Amino acid sequence: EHLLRPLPADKQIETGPFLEAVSHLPPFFDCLGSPVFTPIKADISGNITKIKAVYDTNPTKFRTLQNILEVEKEMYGAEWPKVGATLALMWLKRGLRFIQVFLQSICDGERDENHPNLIRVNATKAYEMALKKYHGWIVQKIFQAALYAAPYKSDFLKALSKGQNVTEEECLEKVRLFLVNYTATIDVIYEMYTRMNAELNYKV
Numbered sequence: 422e423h424l425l426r427p428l429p430a431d432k433q434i435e436t437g438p439f440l441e442a443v444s445h446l447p448p449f450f451d452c453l454g455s456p457v458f459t460p461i462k463a464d465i466s467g468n469i470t471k472i473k474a475v476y477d478t479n480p481t482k483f484r485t486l487q488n489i490l491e492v493e494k495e496m497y498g499a500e501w502p503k504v505g506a507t508l509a510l511m512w513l514k515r516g517l518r519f520i521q522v523f524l525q526s527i528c529d530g531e532r533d534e535n536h537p538n539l540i541r542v543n544a545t546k547a548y549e550m551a552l553k554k555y556h557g558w559i560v561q562k563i564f565q566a567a568l569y570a571a572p573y574k575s576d577f578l579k580a581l582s583k584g585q586n587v588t589e590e591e592c593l594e595k596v597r598l599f600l601v602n603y604t605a606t607i608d609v610i611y612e613m614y615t616r617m618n619a620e621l622n623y624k625v
């Protein structure tokens with residue numbers, strides 16, 4: 422189904438299942454009609470790959486996301502957290518949060534009444550909340566190009582319903598369900614980065 426696992430009480434997110442779940446997200450970018458999204462997809466997919474690579478060297482040692490941060494802090498010393506899977510996940514979480522905010526905004530019925538069949542307001546909001554603070558104007562220009570090329574809302578919701586024979590209402594209900602464990606998970610990852618002093622503010 423690709424619903425994320427429920428958050429456990431102890432909030433320790435298992436790495437493997439996490440990676441398996443988020444790996445289903447990049448394919449949704451393909452359904453969009455442009456190479457102009459390939460930068461945002463590639464980034465998320467690239468960071469997933471980096472984390473999986475570290476995890477696969479020792480799944481036991483890296484069983485949870487917290488384990489990754491703990492182990493790599495120990496391993497890399499003062500270079501940490503600008504290293505390894507910690508750094509990849511630092512960026513991944515921002516792309517995941519973008520998706521979260523974008524989907525939640527759409528589900529919540531946020532829109533520009535002048536352009537109700539566009540998703541520019543939702544993408545902008547998501548971009549400003551998740552990614553913009555971490556991008557210089559070169560990269561922001563790359564992201565605007567994807568904004569202006571965003572699909573129509575109706576076409577976007579069609580792309581998500583490629584399951585199928587589903588109204589836009591029903592589609593949105595499925596998205597709201599996905600958002601529950603997804604949001605919780607991303608929030609927990611953010612909370613972890615802050616707690617572990619793993620968050621960096623440098624721009625790319």
Ligand SMILES: CCCCCCCCCC(=O)O
Pocket residue numbers: 446449450453520523581595596599
């Ligand atoms: C019900 C699961 C829906 C998952 C949708 C992921 C959408 C990616 C967002 C985007 O392409 O800009």
Ligand SMILES: [Cl-]
Pocket residue numbers: 535536537538539
């Ligand atoms: Cl419109």
